Design a protein around this nucleic acid. Structure first.
Ligand SMILES: *O[C]1[C]([C]OP([O])(=O)OP([O])(=O)OP([O])(=O)O[C][C]2O[C](N3=[C]N([C])C4=C3N=C([N])[N]C4=O)[C]([O])[C]2[O])O[C](N2[C]=NC3=C2N=[C]N=C3[N])[C]1O[C]
Lengths: 621, 552, 670
RNA sequence: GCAAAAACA
RNA sequence: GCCUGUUUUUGCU
RNA sequence: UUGCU
RNA sequence: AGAGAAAUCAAG
């Protein structure tokens, strides 16, 4: 509690209601000082007896009526304002205990009773010294010295001296000018005193309406959304190369390849391939950084932001007006479900090779068994290979951004199979990248092997045909701009495996908890909706497509996706409630779909999730 | 040598007087304010530049030295050919620690043992515990505060600074500060930290020593019945799907057994129990022995409440435990008055029942499949004084969806089911926001504070207990209850900032032993001098007697 | 969404983990904050009347309105004075122990609070440099300004700091005189404007919202004043059942679970947010509530004045506008202040003061989270509401135990109308009531039969930090351990997180494939022996709490010679640039000073690419000379110089050296 | 007390 | 460029 | 200079 | 160009 160590518990309890400490300057400190005075009275009246009764009787902190009673037993009267702390029997002298900071000149406070003045460190006044005995003086000095060491330990010397002297500064005051400044923007004083009686009025409100059917999210109508992501995803492929270093693989590819443009986009001119070739040569010579030649200006937007300004100034005509930016609305593309069907096909290799942790206990063994099961049921899957490609590319591009250059940096995307053969996914070329803030955009030229081409899905990609040792491949060559923060985020994209692993582990451990045994081989039947029906699915395939969708959501994370996910949790909870025969009630102007509809603008996976929500039933009988 | 230390302390104090005119004219107490000015230590996103930092040509910054060769086997380890001599100036590759791990100077095995002692405690604590078989099931979390890690001693947080001061710098302590320290903790911590302090700085030494005696409780979900002592190994021993049973537990039981005064104190008066807590175990006063042991024992709780402290004891009948979630009125002599919801726990069995007066409104239970429910419901009925039975009071329902069978088995199929019994929905963990206001009265019954009237008793102190062994070192000399068991002091009288005409002793220890009648000690630039005690009575009994003299 | 809605094995609530796009990039704000700041300024005035009339609502000072003025079909900025008075009276009559502990705080802890606690803040607006500066720097410069304008020393207490602010507000003219050399001047009006000014900034890397929002920071002239109010509000909130903000983590979940008592015929659960918070609440309502609380306690006038200073200053707040509203003529872009050309914020032109704009209504800032929570909690105290309420700042959950559905609807409507009387305005579209309780949401925590675990909440963590291999390993392992202990991460997820963190962490410290470090190890026959060196992991799922070195030593994977090499306290890798103290227990010389290095050679410091340091030197010499300030608060008398000199003389005196040698040592002290 | 990181409002 | 409040992890003083 | 499945 | 989303980067 707040009791000081030297203050006795009984004294602290007795001082709780003696004075209203809240209304006094340093109420806690003055309570401690009053406890000091009471303890001094206790020590003075310790155990001396005169005629079978104690020599000194203490008037302090005693029921008042009893005080006048015991004082009238001796035929004595005292004023109400000033009452002596203790009274003696032999000398018949009333004594008041005073604590003072000086003893050189201490005149009697009043003629009614004499005073026992004590310093803060023990010494007493000469008359007080002669009245009392040596034992009392030593006890008081020791107690006051304990009080003084507690004071100096807590750095309360200034407050204690203030309370002892009695000046009692208000401890906070507001002047006149500051009060006038404060009261400028309010109708009340510093301490408001409204003249209205406290009352709670009765307000006629509205009625809560049942949500009898789940809200239907609106589907935006417009052109289908293109593939707007840093890399390919499903169409990502690699070229198999002999085992070696990145330089050796790049040299082999550059010396055993020919490139011919087959599809060209206005967004990415077909000339920029030259830049790639230059890098593919420079990296083949051990120099990942090369110099500009002629086509880096178009590829990386060199010397832009100034041609556009002069063009706008030449074309400027009219009067200034507010910005009113517009975001184009786009419909669900046909390639999203094809993407989801892909990313799930099996692969030859595991593509998830994480070193196993140690095993010391049985819990450790079951944990590693569960992790191994999850890895082998989601490992040989296209999502794993695409995640590895994304992580490698993001890290290789990020590692070349914590500096300022003006030349072209080449970041290869090369993985390795257990046999050791190199796997060429693509090549990232970094422009000048004079970046000053993490959210600033550095130019990039992304070449990367592609399986299938689509004009609708890749309108800004200039597809090239690449022939390497009688094998045919497709190359992307997109011009993009990307930030350090996003590149760092995608450098750790392997963390997306946690959520489907969480679902799988929850299912398996729930089944293990129903009985009292772990199987670790359970493949139960998850009941889902699919195309509006109610049909079963195996757990492994469910986890696989959950991984696919989670990856696709992670690579397409924008403000629209963030808002849509944040506001769809309420609707998901409402659906889960309605599936359990629970009624859902809403306030008067409640339209929870609008806060979700506002986030559906052009994000293809947001539209995919919205269509998935709309397909499954809205009414639960 | 001490001469080197003294000369290094000089010209560092002198060094901080020419280049810092100010910051020395300020008051010393202002150190509590400007010690927080640690600007230029800040940085942003270390994780976003770690990779690039490791792959820089010279990532590691170190003080110049000669033990690291310039070039080793064709690899240029360091970059010492620079503007050498600027403190942490030398730059070295990431492989320099790798070089040192194989080629480098070695220290004594004692140094290695001292460095790893704190971590080795945990390491061989992990391998010294036997693990039972894993049991898979749906265990509802309890979400209680539990101690983070085991400690060598139980010391209240008020005595921790004094204990550390006695361990590390006894020469700067007072006798009042000394008596507040835990002496046994001081001795064992001195033994522990004697080798450690040779390899750790003062700050690290104090941090380790305090980590060895601090409680530092944390809120975690646990199993309701098998609550672990410490949360050191709770990440694998418990979860929401599995549990692992362990048998490792332990003075707290001895300290609870030490409470025998409450037995022979019902007749004379309640004042005696508080008056007779003048005993000192070892050198630790009974005032300070408590606040070190926050156990569930009822007698220990009674003593803690008598001290003005709190207790964590929950009412416990037979094998079940009960806790009032809320109540319009407290239990009266026992039966309920008005609406009352009570959480009950008994092994894996748990739930809450709502009742009015002596009639149960309903019961909610979360129980294992095919588990008997005779004793918990019987204990609930005894608690509420409902039956004088259970089937007649609750009633019988024709619905088969209810879980409770007439035989009182969880989820047992039957032709009929007990009505107003429902599966729980995680009402567990009764929670109190404001700290409970324990009050002690006659007969030594512990009461809390309720909104309406005095709240029901928690420690009944009519229970049937044992007479187990007393804790070692108990000193009943200063008590009138010596039958439980089977030259004067110094007062201060003086505080000065300048050396008095006394004799200055090295520590509070090496004092009080030669028996001199006047001596000083030092503490934070102040000299506290003690002489003797000529008064033949203490202060606590003095105040007791003088307040007793003020009675009507 | 159909793939996220299981129907047989697990429930949809357990799949709320899947509705998280984390591990993907977080949105950032790009340009001027002026538009968002002006929307925040203009929203309070549009909501004061049922029919939006900003011009008529711009000339009001206290946002007090009649009960029929309150909007029931939309946001309603303002409050009803009588309602606040009566509700505060009811809240004080209930929860008596909370008010007793408030009185205890006022008596004991308030005089003990130091202004150095203001150093615990973050980037703070500086009224001297008109720029964001670190909180210690702002506190130091403000204290120096007060020192050299008041011609007196400020006590360490926060009350002394507040009194110094109040006193310097009285002076007609003030000067700063930094002498980094440069001198700046103020006036009462200028200093008032600087104190009432809130700097604004875009908030970056915020997830879960489509629209970027603007945050604000005040100056040190008012942070001290707000500190007392926030501390008192926290003291009250920790002792009331209906609060949710003082508790957090697992204790908050325990408090929530203690209230899930569904025993009546109708048991509903209403989980929801409160729209337009921090701008529909008038600080005068907070003043009134605090004044009622302190007046029913019996506190004197100075306490009430001190508690009323912060809200009354925020009534005169000046929100700092950004770089100006954006305008386009053709394809060009320009930034213009509010008053140059017509826009959608023309009504506020009269409130422009320099580059700052005034706003009497609202807080504009979440600077009073605890006080706003207290206001929302006093809104609940009436006989009509018999449910259980939990309110943190603007997220709330309510439990209704009603005999009939109609009574439950009446209670829900009464709750909405009370929060409107105070002016809280729960969002209708974000508030959902389930008539049989059991499924609920609070603070991103979903519960169906228990508070279900959430992954992707800890996935922003689990990335290795950049201190050193040992520190990074401790970070990762203990973060995963906390995730497992809390319940957000089970056995399989925990072990997979360990494997992912280990693999990424070993990649970061060049321990995978063929790198320069691996080549150096291989060509010099250096076996890894450690996780950061490429060795197999020693940490298991059950040993996440154990140190790598000690566990490897126990298991025999690390021999004694390698241990003696790596744990050398004299290794050059981590050698400190200055000698350090060492305690010497059981020795006649209690302290020694010598050069030191971090024991582990793998705890090095990573270099970084290329003055009030006197305070650190003073702190270091004080710590070396005064061991006891390392364990307890400093209390030695006198100035630092003289106290340190006396301590040094005492240390030399007790060194047991020869007398002439002691004199020689003492003679060098200056 | 300081520094870093994370979550939520 | 990164407010306030509440938790949590680690390390250093 | 360049190698995470 | 492009990234992108209620305004910015595409250098100074
Ligand atoms: O803030 C901080 C605190 C925390 O906790 P709380 O609860 O809040 O309080 P407490 O614990 O009770 O108190 P203490 O700690 O016992 O004491 C106080 C004093 O003393 C000092 N210190 C302490 N410690 C422990 C220490 C010190 N110093 C140094 N240098 N080191 C150490 O360690 C202080 O300052 C004061 O004056 O508490 C404290 N803490 C904790 N931890 C820590 C601290 N500090 C510092 N550091 C650390 N590490 C604080 O207060 C201020």
């Amino acid at each position: 509690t707040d009791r000081p160590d030297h203050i006795d518990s009984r004294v602290w309890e007795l001082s709780e209601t003696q004075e209203d400490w809240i209304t006094q300057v340093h109420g806690h400190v003055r309570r401690v000082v009053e406890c000091w005075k009471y303890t001094i009275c206790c020590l003075i009246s310790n155990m001396h007896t005169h005629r079978g009764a104690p020599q000194y009787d203490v008037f302090k902190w005693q029921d008042r009526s009893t005080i006048e009673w015991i004082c009238s037993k001796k035929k004595v009267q005292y004023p109400e304002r000033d009452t002596p702390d203790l009274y003696d029997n032999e000398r018949a002298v009333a004594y008041k205990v005073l604590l003072v900071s000086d003893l050189s000149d201490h005149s009697p406070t009043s003629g009614i009773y004499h005073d026992l003045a004590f310093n803060l460190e023990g010494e007493a006044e000469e008359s007080c010294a002669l009245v009392l005995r040596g034992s009392q003086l030593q006890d008081i000095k020791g107690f006051l010295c304990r009080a003084l060491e507690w004071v100096v330990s807590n750095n309360l010397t200034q407050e204690v001296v203030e309370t002892i002297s009695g000046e009692a500064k208000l401890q906070f005051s507001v002047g006149t000018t500051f009060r006038t400044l404060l009261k400028r923007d309010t109708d009340w004083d510093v301490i408001p005193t409204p003249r209205v009686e406290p009352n709670v009025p009765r307000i006629e409100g509205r009625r809560w309406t049942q949500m009898k059917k789940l809200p239907l999210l609106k589907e935006k109508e417009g052109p289908p959304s293109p593939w707007r992501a840093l890399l390919l995803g499903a169409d990502s492929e690699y070229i198999v190369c002999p085992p070696g270093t990145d330089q050796e693989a790049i040299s082999w590819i550059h010396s055993q390849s020919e490139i011919e443009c087959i599809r060209e986009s206005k967004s990415t001119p077909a000339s920029v391939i030259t830049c790639l070739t230059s890098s593919l040569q420079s990296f083949a010579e051990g120099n990942p950084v090369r110099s500009r030649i002629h086509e880096d200006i178009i590829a990386f937007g060199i010397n832009k932001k100034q041609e556009k300004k002069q063009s706008a100034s030449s074309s400027a005509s009219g009067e200034w007006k507010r910005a009113e930016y517009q975001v184009e609305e786009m419909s669900l593309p046909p390639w999203v479900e094809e993407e989801m069907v892909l990313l799930r096909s099996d692969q030859e290799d595991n593509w998830i090779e994480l070193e196993k942790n140690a095993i010391y206990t049985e819990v450790d063994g079951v944990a590693e068994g569960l992790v191994d099961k999850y890895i082998e049921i989601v490992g040989r899957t296209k999502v794993a290979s695409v995640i590895e490609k994304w992580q490698i590319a993001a890290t290789r591009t990020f590692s070349q951004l914590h500096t300022d250059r003006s030349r072209i940096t080449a970041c290869p995307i090369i993985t390795r199979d257990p046999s050791g053969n190199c796997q060429f996914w693509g090549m990232v070329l970094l422009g000048p990248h004079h970046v000053k803030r993490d959210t600033d955009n550095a130019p990039l030229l992304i070449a990367e092997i592609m399986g299938e081409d689509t004009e609708e899905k890749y309108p800004k990609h200039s597809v090239f045909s690449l022939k390497v040792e009688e094998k045919q491949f497709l190359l992307s060559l997109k011009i993009t701009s990307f930030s350090r923060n996003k590149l760092y985020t995608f450098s750790n994209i392997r963390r997306v495996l946690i959520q489907p692993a969480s679902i799988y582990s929850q299912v398996v451990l729930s089944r293990a908890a129903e009985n009292n045994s772990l199987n670790l081989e359970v493949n139960p039947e998850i009941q889902l909706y699919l195309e509006g029906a109610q049909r079963g699915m195996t757990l492994y395939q469910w986890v696989r497509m959950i991984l696919c969708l989670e990856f696709l959501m992670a690579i397409y994370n924008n403000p629209q996706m963030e808002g849509f996910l944040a506001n769809m949790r309420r609707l998901h909870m409402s659906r889960h409630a309605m599936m359990e025969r629970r009624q859902v009630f809403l306030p008067f102007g409640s339209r929870p779909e609008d806060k979700v509809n506002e986030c559906i603008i052009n994000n293809p996976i947001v539209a995919y999730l919205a269509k998935g929500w709309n397909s499954m039933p809205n009414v639960y009988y | 040598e001490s001469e080197c230390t003294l000369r290094a302390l000089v010209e560092e104090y002198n060094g901080a007087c020419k280049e810092a005119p100010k910051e020395m004219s300020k008051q010393f107490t202002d150190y509590n304010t400007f010690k927080r000015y640690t600007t230029s230590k800040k940085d942003h996103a270390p994780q976003m530049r770690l990779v690039y930092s490791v792959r820089k040509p010279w990532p590691i910054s170190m003080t110049p030295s000669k033990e690291i060769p310039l070039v080793f086997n064709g690899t240029k380890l360091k970059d010492t050919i620079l503007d050498l001599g600027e403190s942490k100036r030398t730059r070295a590759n990431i492989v320099v620690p790798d070089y040192w791990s194989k080629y480098g100077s070695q220290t004594s095995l004692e140094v290695v043992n001292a460095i790893l002692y704190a971590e080795d405690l945990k390491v061989q604590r992990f391998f010294s515990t036997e693990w039972g078989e894993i049991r898979y099931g749906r265990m509802l979390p309890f979400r209680k505060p539990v101690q983070a890690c085991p400690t060598i001693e139980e010391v209240n947080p008020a005595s921790i600074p004094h204990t550390l001061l006695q361990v590390f710098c006894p020469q700067y302590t007072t006798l009042d500060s000394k008596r507040k320290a835990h002496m046994g903790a001081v001795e064992k911590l001195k033994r522990v930290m004697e080798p450690i302090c040779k390899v750790q700085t003062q700050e690290s030494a104090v941090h380790i020593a305090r980590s060895l005696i601090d409680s530092n409780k944390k809120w975690l979900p646990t199993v309701v019945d098998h609550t672990p002592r410490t949360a050191e190994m709770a990440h694998f021993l418990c979860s929401k799907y599995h549990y692992v049973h362990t048998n490792t537990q332990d003075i707290d039981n001895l300290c609870g057994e030490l409470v025998k005064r409450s037995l022979k104190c019902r007749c004379p008066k309640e004042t005696l129990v508080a008056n007779l807590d003048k005993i000192t175990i070892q050198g630790r006063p009974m005032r300070e022995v408590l606040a070190d042991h926050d156990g569930e024992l009822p007698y220990l709780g009674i003593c803690r409440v008598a001290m003005g402290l709190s207790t964590h004891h929950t009412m416990k009948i037979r094998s079940t435990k009960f806790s009032i979630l809320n109540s319009d009125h407290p239990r009266i002599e026992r039966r309920f008055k008005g609406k009352a919801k009570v959480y009950f726990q008994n092994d894996q069995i748990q739930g809450y029942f709502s009742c009015t007066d002596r009639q149960i409104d309903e019961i909610k239970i979360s129980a294992p499949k095919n588990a008997p429910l005779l004793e918990p419901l019987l204990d609930i009925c005894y608690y509420g004084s409902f039956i004088e039975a259970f089937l007649i009071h609750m009633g019988l329902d024709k619905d088969l969806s209810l879980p409770l069978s007439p035989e009182l088995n969880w989820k047992e199929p039957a032709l009929s089911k007990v009505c107003r019994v429902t599966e729980l929905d995680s009402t567990v963990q009764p929670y109190t926001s404001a700290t409970r206001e324990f009050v002690l009265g006659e007969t030594l019954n512990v009461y809390t504070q309720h909104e309406n009237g005095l709240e029901l008793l928690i420690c009944p102190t009519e229970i049937r207990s044992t007479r187990g062994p007393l804790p070692p070192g108990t000193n009943l000399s200063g008590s009138e209850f010596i039958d439980i068991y089977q030259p004067e002091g110094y007062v201060q009288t003086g505080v000065f900032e300048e050396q008095p005409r006394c004799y200055l002793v090295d520590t509070p220890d090496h004092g009080l032993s030669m028996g001199l009648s006047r001596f000083c000690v030092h503490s934070q630039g102040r000299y506290f001098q003690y002489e003797k005690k000529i008064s033949i009575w203490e202060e606590t009994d003095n105040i007791k007697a003088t307040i007793d003299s003020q009675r009507d | 969404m159909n793939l996220f809605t299981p129907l047989s094995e697990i429930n949809p609530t357990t799949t709320q983990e899947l509705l998280y796009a984390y591990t993907g990039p977080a949105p950032v704000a790009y340009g001027t904050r002026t538009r968002a700041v002006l929307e925040n300024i203009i929203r309070p005035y549009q909501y004061f009347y049922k029919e939006p009339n900003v011009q008529r609502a711009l000339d009001i000072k206290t946002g007090c309105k009649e009960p029929e003025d309150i909007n029931v079909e939309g946001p309603s900025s303002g409050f009803h004075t009588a309602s606040v008075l009566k509700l505060a009276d009811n809240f004080f009559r209930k929860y008596r122990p909370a008010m007793e502990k408030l009185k205890y705080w006022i008596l004991v802890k308030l005089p003990k609070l130091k202004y150095a606690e203001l150093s615990k803040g973050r980037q703070t607006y500086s009224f001297i440099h008109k720029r964001n500066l670190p909180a210690p720097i702002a506190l130091e410069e403000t204290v120096e300004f007060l020192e050299q304008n008041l011609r007196r020393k400020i006590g360490p207490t926060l009350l002394s700091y507040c009194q110094a602010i109040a006193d310097v507000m009285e002076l007609d003219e003030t000067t700063y005189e930094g002498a980094r050399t440069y001198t700046i001047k103020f006036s009462r009006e200028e200093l008032w404007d600087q104190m009432r000014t809130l700097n604004t900034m875009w908030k970056h890397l915020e997830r879960g919202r489509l629209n970027r929002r603007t945050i604000a920071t005040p100056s040190m002239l008012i942070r001290g004043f707000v500190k007392i109010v926030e501390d008192a509000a926290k003291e009250i909130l920790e002792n009331v059942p209906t609060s949710g903000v003082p508790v957090g983590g697992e204790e908050k979940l325990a408090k929530l679970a203690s209230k899930q008592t569904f025993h009546t015929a109708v048991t509903g659960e209403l989980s929801g947010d409160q729209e337009k918070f921090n701008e529909c609440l008038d600080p005068d309502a907070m003043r009134l509530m605090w004044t009622v609380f302190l007046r029913k306690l019996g506190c004197p006038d100075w306490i009430m004045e001190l508690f009323n200073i912060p809200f009354m200053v925020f009534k005169s707040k000046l929100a700092d506008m950004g770089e100006g509203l954006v305008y386009t003529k053709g394809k060009l872009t320009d930034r213009k202040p509010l008053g140059e050309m017509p826009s959608e914020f023309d009504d506020l032109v009269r409130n422009v003061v320099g580059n700052s704009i005034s706003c009497r209504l609202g807080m504009f800032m979440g600077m009073y989270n605890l006080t706003s929570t207290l206001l929302a909690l006093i809104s609940i105290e009436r006989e009509e509401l018999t449910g259980s309420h939990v309110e943190s700042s603007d997220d709330f959950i309510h439990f209704f135990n009603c005999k009939t559905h109609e009574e439950m609807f009446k209670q829900a409507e009464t709750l909405r109308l009370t929060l409107k009387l105070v002016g809280i305005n729960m969002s209708p579209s974000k508030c959902i009531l389930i008539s049989p309780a059991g499924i609920g949401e609070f603070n991103s925590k979903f519960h169906h039969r228990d508070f279900v675990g959430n992954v992707a909440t800890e996935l922003p963590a689990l990335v290795p930090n950049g201190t050193n291999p040992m520190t990074d390993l401790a970070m990762g392992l203990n973060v995963i351990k906390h995730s497992v202990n809390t319940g957000q991460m089970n056995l399989c997820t925990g072990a997979l997180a360990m494997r992912i963190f280990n693999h990424a962490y070993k990649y970061a410290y060049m321990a995978l494939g063929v790198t320069r470090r691996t080549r150096f190890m291989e060509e010099n026959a250096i076996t890894p022996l450690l996780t950061n060196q490429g060795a197999s992991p020693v940490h298991s799922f059950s040993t996440m709490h154990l140190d790598e070195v000690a566990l490897r030593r126990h298991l025999g994977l690390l021999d004694e010679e390698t241990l003696r090499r790596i744990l050398n306290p004299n290794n050059p890798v981590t050698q400190k640039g200055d000698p350090s103290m060492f305690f010497r227990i059981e020795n006649k010389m209690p302290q020694i000073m010598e050069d030191y290095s971090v024991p582990s050679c793998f705890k090095y410091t990573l270099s970084r690419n290329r003055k009030e340091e006197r305070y650190q030197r003073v702190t270091s010499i004080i710590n070396k000379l005064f061991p006891e300030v390392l364990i307890q608060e400093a209390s030695a008398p006198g100035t630092v110089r003289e106290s340190l000199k006396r301590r040094l003389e005492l240390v030399v005196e007790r060194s047991d050296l020869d007398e002439e040698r002691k004199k020689r040592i003492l003679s060098r002290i200056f």
